[PDB]
Amino acid sequence: SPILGYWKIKGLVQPTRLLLEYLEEKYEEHLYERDEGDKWRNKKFELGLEFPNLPYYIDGDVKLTQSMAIIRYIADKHNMLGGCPKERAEISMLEGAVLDIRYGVSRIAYSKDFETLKVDFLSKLPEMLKMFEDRLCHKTYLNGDHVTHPDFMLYDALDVVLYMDPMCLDAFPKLVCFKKRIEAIPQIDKYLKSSKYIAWPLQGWQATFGGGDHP
Amino acid sequence: SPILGYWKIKGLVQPTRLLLEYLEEKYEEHLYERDEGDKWRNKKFELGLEFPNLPYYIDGDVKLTQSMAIIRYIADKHNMLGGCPKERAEISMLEGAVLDIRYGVSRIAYSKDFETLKVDFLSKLPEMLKMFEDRLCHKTYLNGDHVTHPDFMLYDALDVVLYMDPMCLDAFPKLVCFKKRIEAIPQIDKYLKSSKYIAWPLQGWQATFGGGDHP
Ligand SMILES: *SC[C@H](NC(=O)CC[C@H](N)C(=O)O)C(=O)NCC(=O)O
Ligand SMILES: *SC[C@H](NC(=O)CC[C@H](N)C(=O)O)C(=O)NCC(=O)O
Numbered sequence: 001s002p003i004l005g006y007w008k009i010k011g012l013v014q015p016t017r018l019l020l021e022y023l024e025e026k027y028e029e030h031l032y033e034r035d036e037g038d039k040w041r042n043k044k045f046e047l048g049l050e051f052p053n054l055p056y057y058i059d060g061d062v063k064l065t066q067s068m069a070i071i072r073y074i075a076d077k078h079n080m081l082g083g084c085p086k087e088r089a090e091i092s093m094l095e096g097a098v099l100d101i102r103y104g105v106s107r108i109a110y111s112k113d114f115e116t117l118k119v120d121f122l123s124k125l126p127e128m129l130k131m132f133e134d135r136l137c138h139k140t141y142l143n144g145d146h147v148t149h150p151d152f153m154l155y156d157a158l159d160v161v162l163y164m165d166p167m168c169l170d171a172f173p174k175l176v177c178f179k180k181r182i183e184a185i186p187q188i189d190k191y192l193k194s195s196k197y198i199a200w201p202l203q204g205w206q207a208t209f210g211g212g213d214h215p
Numbered sequence: 216s217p218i219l220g221y222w223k224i225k226g227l228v229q230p231t232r233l234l235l236e237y238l239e240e241k242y243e244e245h246l247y248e249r250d251e252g253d254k255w256r257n258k259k260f261e262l263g264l265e266f267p268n269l270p271y272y273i274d275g276d277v278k279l280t281q282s283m284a285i286i287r288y289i290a291d292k293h294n295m296l297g298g299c300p301k302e303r304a305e306i307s308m309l310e311g312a313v314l315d316i317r318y319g320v321s322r323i324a325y326s327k328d329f330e331t332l333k334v335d336f337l338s339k340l341p342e343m344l345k346m347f348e349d350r351l352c353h354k355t356y357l358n359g360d361h362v363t364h365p366d367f368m369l370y371d372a373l374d375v376v377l378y379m380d381p382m383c384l385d386a387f388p389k390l391v392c393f394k395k396r397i398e399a400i401p402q403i404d405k406y407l408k409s410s411k412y413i414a415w416p417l418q419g420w421q422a423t424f425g426g427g428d429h430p
């Protein structure tokens with residue numbers, strides 16, 4: 001059974017969890033708690049990883065790090081990355097545009113100056129969201145009728161920015177619908193209600209925004 | 216003929232240029248100068264881009280943004296991304312590990328506190344480089360005998376960190392060799408000597424590190 005290792009937080013790996021659950025894939029997790037740095041450090045170089053880091057994904061011979069390599073691998077095994085170079089590039093474009101939002105948050109979330117930095121981020125956020133709002137015209141998911149991994153990435157990004165500004169989707173009804181559509185996927189509905197769902201923190205526990213043991 | 220648009224800097228797009236040149240692909244560039252923000256802003260929404268941004272790559276019907284989508288697209292058209300999910304994931308892992316170095320620089324390069332932040336980055340850099348040093352044991356390129364896009368990404372990262380600390384590869388002879396190997400690829404040798412090579416800046420011109428009109 002594959003092993004997905006990360007801090008017991010949403011962070012970089014939450015879209016991967018959602019994708020695995022969507023696919024009904026069997027996996028176990030190594031979940032490092034806030035005080036378990038020592039535990040991670042004692043395993044870091046003992047797992048066969050060529051590029052030791054968190055998250056990791058171990059699947060027989062396959063030992064992977066890099067969150068994006070991992071999510072894309074799971075997707076790839078299910079024939080989800082795209083049917084030709086142009087569609088693969090389209091999906092990678094969606095992926096990167098989501099990361100501009102999600103990393104946009106993480107870039108500032110650990111700063112002493114988060115509250116001032118938040119102003120600048122929220123000023124740019126509507127422009128980024130509008131691109132997705134436009135993309136969703138006449139589409140159920142970002143690539144139309146079928147789910148792709150960026151859908152779970154975008155889902156996670158929306159979850160996160162809504163904590164930062166609960167009104168940030170008020171101008172984007174299609175994105176509001178989209179978030180509900182993901183939540184309506186029966187596998188996702190079940191997961192979000194399950195003992196396996198990690199609601200919080202959004203970032204590493206030490207973050208100024210999206211950190212701490214509880215919201 | 217495809218169009219690659221970016222600021223006239225190395226920045227996010229330099230590995231893409233190197234890959235195109237390696238492949239002997241025909242392309243033209245839209246190169247925005249330091250004072251040409253207005254020019255970019257007047258084109259940004261007039262190019263058919265679904266996710267307007269820099270860089271962009273326009274190839275007939277195909278209008279792409281996201282630097283990583285673009286480099287991977289060029290690679291994909293040349294059957295370079297990997298022969299199966301595991302190899303594709305391996306290549307995406309290399310890609311992400313390079314980005315930890317290259318984005319590691321960009322994260323701090325625009326800060327007023329760059330000089331203090333540099334200490335922390337240079338403290339972590341040897342650990343990141345060692346993973347690549349180990350990977351290159353008995354290999355010509357990162358994936359062995361054949362070039363892949365992360366080779367050009369790593370090349371660009373080494374170029375950049377050597378400006379920050381010219382001694383940072385003193386402990387990593389295989390990486391030193393690697394950088395020279397890339398420079399010895401005849402297409403790359405020619406490109407680096409050509410009028411098309413943009414030597415500087417490394418970052419946006421306004422950066423504290425790797426900015427300005429000249430080094
Ligand atoms: S991957 C094969 C090509 N399809 C697409 O590019 C799909 C585009 C959208 N992502 C979608 O509609 O889902 C292909 O061969 N298309 C036929 C063509 O017009 O050439
Ligand atoms: S999908 C966005 C546009 N449609 C609408 O606004 C119709 C009203 C719907 N209730 C809604 O989606 O808001 C649209 O079709 N834009 C593209 C076009 O060709 O006009």
Ligand SMILES: *SC[C@H](NC(=O)CC[C@H](N)C(=O)O)C(=O)NCC(=O)O
Pocket residue numbers: 136137138139140173174175176177178
């Ligand atoms: S949210 C689902 C989409 N409807 C609208 O955008 C209308 C929004 C209302 N005007 C509002 O709440 O303000 C939609 O068109 N969905 C169709 C689809 O194929 O996704």
Ligand SMILES: *SC[C@H](NC(=O)CC[C@H](N)C(=O)O)C(=O)NCC(=O)O
Pocket residue numbers: 297298299300301302305358359
């Ligand atoms: S993509 C097909 C598989 N090959 C690899 O994974 C290549 C691994 C390295 N990147 C390399 O050697 O270049 C494959 O089918 N391998 C055969 C097997 O052992 O199953």
Ligand SMILES: *SC[C@H](NC(=O)CC[C@H](N)C(=O)O)C(=O)NCC(=O)O
Pocket residue numbers: 351352353
């Ligand atoms: S590739 C690194 C190891 N080889 C050497 O150190 C031999 C000397 C060479 N001049 C050099 O590469 O430095 C090596 O083989 N490590 C793996 C192993 O199986 O020992």
Ligand SMILES: *SC[C@H](NC(=O)CC[C@H](N)C(=O)O)C(=O)NCC(=O)O
Pocket residue numbers: 351352353354355388389390391392393
């Ligand atoms: S740099 C090329 C590799 N040689 C070494 O690592 C030895 C380095 C010296 N000890 C030194 O300069 O300090 C190498 O083994 N290359 C073979 C390959 O297949 O790449």
Ligand SMILES: N[C@@H](CCC(=O)N[C@@H](CS)C(=O)NCC(=O)O)C(=O)O
Pocket residue numbers: 011012044052053054055065066067068311312315
């Ligand atoms: N580019 C990497 C970044 C990984 C990373 O920064 N991981 C942090 C957690 S968010 C960590 O704790 N890494 C463990 C380590 O470096 O030992 C990825 O996307 O996986």
Ligand SMILES: N[C@@H](CCC(=O)N[C@@H](CS)C(=O)NCC(=O)O)C(=O)O
Pocket residue numbers: 096097100226227259267268269270280281282283
């Ligand atoms: N995730 C994007 C980031 C792109 C980006 O930040 N581009 C900057 C230059 S480094 C820019 O000037 N963008 C133009 C714009 O936003 O209008 C990518 O990798 O392409």
